[PDB]
Amino acid sequence: LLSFLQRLFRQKKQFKIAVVGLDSAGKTTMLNFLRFEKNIETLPTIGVNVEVLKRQNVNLSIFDLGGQLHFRNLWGTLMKGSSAIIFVMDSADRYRIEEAKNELWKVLLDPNYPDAPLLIVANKQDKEGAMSIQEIISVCGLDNPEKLGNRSWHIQPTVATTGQGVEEAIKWIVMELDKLL
Amino acid sequence: LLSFLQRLFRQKKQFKIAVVGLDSAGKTTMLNFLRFEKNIETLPTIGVNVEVLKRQNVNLSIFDLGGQLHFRNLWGTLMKGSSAIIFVMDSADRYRIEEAKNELWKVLLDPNYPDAPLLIVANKQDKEGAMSIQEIISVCGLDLGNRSWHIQPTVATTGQGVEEAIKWIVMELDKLL
Numbered sequence A: 001l002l003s004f005l006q007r008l009f010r011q012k013k014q015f016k017i018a019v020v021g022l023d024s025a026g027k028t029t030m031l032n033f034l035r036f037e038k039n040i041e042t043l044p045t046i047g048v049n050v051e052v053l054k055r056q057n058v059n060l061s062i063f064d065l066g067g068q069l070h071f072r073n074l075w076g077t078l079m080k081g082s083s084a085i086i087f088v089m090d091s092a093d094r095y096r097i098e099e100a101k102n103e104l105w106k107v108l109l110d111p112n113y114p115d116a117p118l119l120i121v122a123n124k125q126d127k128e129g130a131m132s133i134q135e136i137i138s139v140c141g142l143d144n145p146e147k148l149g150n151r152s153w154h155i156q157p158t159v160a161t162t163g164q165g166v167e168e169a170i171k172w173i174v175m176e177l178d179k180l181l
Numbered sequence B: 001l002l003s004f005l006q007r008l009f010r011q012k013k014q015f016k017i018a019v020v021g022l023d024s025a026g027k028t029t030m031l032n033f034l035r036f037e038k039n040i041e042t043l044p045t046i047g048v049n050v051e052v053l054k055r056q057n058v059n060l061s062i063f064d065l066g067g068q069l070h071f072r073n074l075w076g077t078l079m080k081g082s083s084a085i086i087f088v089m090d091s092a093d094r095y096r097i098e099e100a101k102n103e104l105w106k107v108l109l110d111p112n113y114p115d116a117p118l119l120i121v122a123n124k125q126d127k128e129g130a131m132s133i134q135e136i137i138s139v140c141g142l143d144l145g146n147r148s149w150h151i152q153p154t155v156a157t158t159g160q161g162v163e164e165a166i167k168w169i170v171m172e173l174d175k176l177l
């Protein structure tokens, strides 16, 4: 299971996969498949300890955007050292899609990691109200990608509750970080 | 309705009520009965912004304890200037009552506001496995001395016990009593 995670484990460096999105998008449900164990990341400047996940040299940092607590410089503090970003959206939630779009663009336009590959996960594709990946790309202003620049990006439909598309989502991230490709 | 909130509005100072407890205890649900307006408290010196509920000179700050974030000096940073504390517990969750007890004692043994009144809210009393307020007192070892405290059973979904819970806090903050 996920044999290709060895493409990260074999490299002599530390990886951090930032997994962000609004609450209830499905981030925890999606990453539960990896069975990574809890790790504590200390942020001495802020004076806060953060519960993250880690297996060997790969750290998964999951964070709800638009929650009760916001970091003023998320990408310079909790997400410092980000190698790749997974932005998870609830594709069935049209009430929150404009907020999700707005949070996605705050990540894309942040100056800390402009070259970190970013995967949009269009989650909850099993629900009757689910937006297509084409509609998500249009609503997000990604049909004509110019503001994104040279950043590698992709969109993957998923059903995190069954695991549909989850292995393919992780594969895209690992492939973008694989020095052998 | 809640006419006694005027006992805070008519006092010439700012009040901050820290509303803390584990995630899913019922903090947001309990406070919705007040209809305060969502606002953003910015804290540039700590590096975070927080959602607060505001009405006139009263601010309510909700924070989930024992979750992903653990602040070293919560009562001197995020909850600085707390006038009163409301600690909400899911009384029906025996799987998390020991973590709630541990978080409560971390709050009690903290040196920032050792005398702001503290209300323990034993929420979800409507649920089948709900613990009594006496069993919560026994589990948490509350059977302090230098601090004003009370425990109130509530059903945040219907509002049962919520008026008495806010009433106790306002009475503790009311210099006209």
Ligand SMILES: Nc1nc2c(ncn2[C@@H]2O[C@H](COP(=O)(O)OP(=O)(O)O)[C@@H](O)[C@H]2O)c(=O)[nH]1
Pocket: A021, A022, A023, A024, A025, A026, A027, A028, A029, A030, A064, A088, A123, A124, A125, A126, A127, A158, A159, A160, A161, A162
């Ligand atoms: N129908 C459906 N529900 C999902 C899916 N993924 C997650 N959920 C549910 O959405 C809710 C929020 O999921 P969670 O992983 O906690 O979200 P997070 O806050 O982004 O970590 C939970 O009730 C999940 O069971 C999905 O693909 N389809």
Ligand SMILES: Nc1nc2c(ncn2[C@@H]2O[C@H](COP(=O)(O)OP(=O)(O)O)[C@@H](O)[C@H]2O)c(=O)[nH]1
Pocket: B021, B022, B023, B024, B025, B026, B027, B028, B029, B030, B064, B088, B123, B124, B125, B126, B127, B154, B155, B156, B157, B158
């Ligand atoms: N049965 C029952 N459910 C409750 C009660 N209070 C809250 N809930 C539910 O518990 C969940 C968590 O409540 P919420 O206000 O988000 O908790 P918070 O994280 O502490 O702010 C929601 O599904 C609420 O509807 C209660 O007194 N009884």
Ligand SMILES: [Mg+2]
Pocket: A023, A024, A064
């Ligand atoms: Mg969440």
Ligand SMILES: [Mg+2]
Pocket: B023, B024, B064
């Ligand atoms: Mg919460």
